[PDB]
Amino acid sequence: EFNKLERRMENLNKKVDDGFLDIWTYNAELLVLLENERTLDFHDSNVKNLYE
Amino acid sequence: NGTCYPGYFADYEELREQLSSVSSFERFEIFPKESSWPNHTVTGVSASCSHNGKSSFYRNLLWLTGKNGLYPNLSKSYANNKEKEVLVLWGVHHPPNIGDQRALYHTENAYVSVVSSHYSRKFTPEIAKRPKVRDQEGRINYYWTLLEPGDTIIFEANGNLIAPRYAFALSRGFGSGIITSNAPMDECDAKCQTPQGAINSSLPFQ
Amino acid sequence: LYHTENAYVSVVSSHYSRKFTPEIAKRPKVRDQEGRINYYWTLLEPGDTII
Ligand SMILES: *[C@@H]1O[C@H](CO)[C@@H](O[C@@H]2O[C@H](CO)[C@@H](O[C@@H]3O[C@H](CO)[C@@H](O)[C@H](O)[C@@H]3O)[C@H](O)[C@H]2NC(C)=O)[C@H](O)[C@H]1NC(C)=O
Ligand SMILES: *[C@@H]1O[C@H](CO)[C@@H](O)[C@H](O)[C@H]1NC(C)=O
Ligand SMILES: *[C@@H]1O[C@H](CO)[C@@H](O)[C@H](O)[C@H]1NC(C)=O
Ligand SMILES: *[C@@H]1O[C@H](CO)[C@@H](O)[C@H](O)[C@H]1NC(C)=O
Structure with a gap:
């Protein structure tokens, strides 16, 4: 909590919170998206290896 | 061109932070010059x-x-x-010698009192060289x-007061700020502005 | 110590100014x-x- 003469500290606190939230959302979404393709490639390679 | 009379400005950066989110205001005379101070003289220059x-x-x-x-x-x-909300400004004078x-002001011990519903302060002059x-x-x-x-808001004084004359009624908005630049002003139209120039692009990075 | 009861200290610069008064207590x-x-x-620039 901040009083009326402490707006810069409040803005800095809000900036820090928003930045960390953005970074972590990006990290989670990118990780899931990138692993989903490798899983399917792995399964296809396994089937091909069994056939060969 | 800032404060032509030397002195100290209290909470200047907080005032800049407050003004960074204002989109328009209305300048109105809070205490008219010709009818508010019958007992005093209102012609003082430096x-x-x-x-x-x-x-x-x-x-x-x-x-x-003082008059008479x-x-x-x-x-x-x-x-x-x-x-x-109304932005009110005032000042207090500190002379260099007792004479x-x-x-x-024809007094040696002077006070200024500014009181609101959630604001209160008292000021005394300091005389020094x-x-x-x-x-x-x-x-x-x-x-x-x-002022909400x-x-x-109430002002009381017996000396050393620089009275308010004009005030502003503020209106807020998003997407504004104060930037420092040397670029000239032209007649174009854009969606992004930087201290170096305007950008007309849809690329994700710059 | 100082042969007075109401004392003041004043320190003034071009962009600095302050006044101090002693407080006597136990x-x-x-x-x-x-x-x-x-x-x-x-x-000091x-x-x-400074005075
Ligand atoms: C607003 O800003 C302008 C500058 O952009 C100020 O003009 C400058 O004012 C100073 C102080 O009066 C002048 O310096 C003086 O020059 C005289 C003559 O050389 C000298 O005898 C003094 O000792 C002092 O150095 C300066 O020359 C002048 N500059 C120009 C270009 O006119 C102006 O005073 C400011 N006004 C307010 C109300 O803040
Ligand atoms: C000073 O001004 C007040 C108005 O606030 C007025 O009532 C009073 O008569 C004035 N003083 C004299 C001596 O007339
Ligand atoms: C002006 O204010 C002082 C201090 O409050 C008080 O002693 C004095 O009586 C006041 N003047 C008048 C005319 O009431
Ligand atoms: C930016 O693009 C808009 C879209 O037509 C145009 O109206 C405007 O003049 C352009 N501004 C600059 C500085 O190129």
Whole structure:
């Protein structure tokens, strides 16, 4: 909590919170998206290896 | 061109932070010059605030002086019937010697009191000899406050008051700020502005 | 010590100004002393004066 003469500290606190939230959302979404393709490639390679 | 009369501005960076989110205001006369101070003189100028080669003063502030050899007590009040926040500014004068104080205000112990519903402060002058900044050894200190709708503000004084003359009714908005630049102004139209120039692009990085 | 009851200290610069008055009271002893001393500092720019 901040009083009326402490707006810069409040803005800095809000900036820090928003930045960390953005970074972590990006990290989670990118990780899931990138692993989903490798899983399917792995399964296809396994089937091909069994056939060969 | 900032403060032509040397002094200290209180909470200047907080005022800049507040003004960074204002999109428009309305400048209105809170205490009219010709009808608010019958007992006092309202014609006071300084050589450090010269305009067109002659000495002058600020436009939103008033310098009160004793009339007929007397400086009676003053008490003024204002109520915010504007449905908006009002920015009020005032000042306090610190002369360089006791003789100047006695010649100007005819008293040696002076006080200024500014009181609101959630604001209260008292000020006393300080008399001392200081290095000259703009050929002046005295000082003036500047103060400001924000008044909520339906609230009242009261000024009481017996000397050393620089009275308010104009106030502003603020209106807020998103997507504004204060930037420092040297670029010239042209007639274009854009969606992004930087201190170096405008950008007309849809790329994700810059 | 000072042969006066109302004393003042004034320190003034081009962009600095302050006034100090002593406060007399009885306080718990810290290093066997009941009085106090308050310390202040400032930075002076080239070509400036302090009084
Ligand atoms: C607003 O800003 C302008 C500058 O952009 C100020 O003009 C400058 O004012 C100073 C102080 O009066 C002048 O310096 C003086 O010059 C005279 C003559 O050389 C000298 O005898 C003095 O000792 C002092 O050094 C300066 O020349 C002048 N500059 C120009 C270009 O006119 C102006 O005073 C400011 N006004 C306010 C109300 O803040
Ligand atoms: C000073 O001004 C007040 C108005 O606030 C007025 O009532 C009073 O009569 C004035 N003083 C004299 C001596 O007339
Ligand atoms: C002006 O104010 C002082 C201090 O409050 C008071 O002593 C004095 O009587 C006041 N003047 C008048 C005319 O009431
Ligand atoms: C930016 O693009 C708009 C879209 O037509 C145009 O109206 C405007 O003049 C352009 N501004 C600059 C500086 O190129």
